[PDB]
Amino acid sequence: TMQLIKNVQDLLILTRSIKEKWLLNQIPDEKQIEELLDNCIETFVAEK
Amino acid sequence: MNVTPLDELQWKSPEWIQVFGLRTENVLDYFAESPFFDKTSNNQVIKMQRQFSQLNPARRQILFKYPMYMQLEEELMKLDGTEYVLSSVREPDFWVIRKQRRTNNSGVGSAKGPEIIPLQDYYIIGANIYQTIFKIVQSRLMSTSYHLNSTLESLYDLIEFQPSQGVHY
Predict the structure, then answer these.
(1) Contact A12 B163 (CB under 8 A)
(2) Nearest residue of chain B to residue A9 (CA atoms)
(3) B41 min Cα distance to partner chain A (Å)
(4) How many Å apart are CA A13 and CA B49, to the nearest integer?
(5) CB count, 10 Å around CB of B42?
(6) Measured between CB atoms, does A12 come within 8 Å of chain B?
(7) Sequence-separated (6 or more) residues with CB below 8 Å from residue B29
(8) Chain B within 8 Å of A48 (Cβ-Cβ)?
């Protein structure tokens, strides 16, 4: 009983450790913005 | 049919000790009515012979101390077989007999006397009688193992496991 249970539990822990290693260890326009800011600043100037 | 082992069998005879009392003189007389005293032993045959005649280290110490013990040899040397003889005595409460069987091998070529071979152990403690240590040891060990099994199964029931920690309580 003790040996079977211990061996199976050890194997399961080993599998989880492998999966954890798998997850962790594996290392891997501008012009439109111009008129956008121009309209924003002129709108604020008018509204201020 | 369930039989209590004779090794643990203990006889008490309050009437006999009340009437006669405990003494080395009648210790064999006390033993006579017990179940352990076989009726086929030559001691009983000697007893009927005496009755019919009337109608018509410490071993050497107890050897030389009593004359009835002498008469026991000179009446027992003639009859070979299962016989009851005293082992040792310390007064006024402790007596033990020696349970041996005799085969008087008078054949040619044997310079030794009659062969004496043990058969059983008997201890007279007070008014009580007691009659293998291997069995005692194995019984104690097996009961210990049973208790250990109970404790370990209870402890394993108490055990709780989680993958992220191991086993805890």
Answers:
(1) yes
(2) B163
(3) 57
(4) 87
(5) 20
(6) yes
(7) B20
(8) no
User: What token pair was written down for A41?
Assistant: 């600043």
Judging contacts by C-beta atoms under 8 Å, the chain A residues touching residue B165 are: none
* β-strand partners of B95: B89, B124
Structure-token pair, residue B161: 């496991």
Compute the distance between CA of residue B149 and CA of residue B144 in angstroms, rounded to an integer. 9
Asked how this structure was determined, the answer is: cryo-EM
Structure tokens at A13: 């822990």
- CA angle, corner B31, sides to B49 and B77, nearest 5? 40
* CA distance from start to end of chain A: 83
Q: Is A8 on the interface with B (CB under 8 A)?
A: no
Output the six-digit token pair for B98.
């020696």
Nearest to B115 by CA among B105, B106, B125, B124: B105
Contact B13, B19 (CB under 8 A): no
A13 CB within 8 Å of a chain B CB: yes
DSSP per residue, A11-38:
HHHHHHHHHHHHHHH-----HHHHHHHH
Residue B34 · residue B11 · CB < 8 Å: yes
Contact B161 A16 (CB under 8 A): no
Q: How far apart are CA B107 and CA B26, in angstroms?
A: 36
The packing angle between helices B58-65 and B67-76, to 10°, is 100
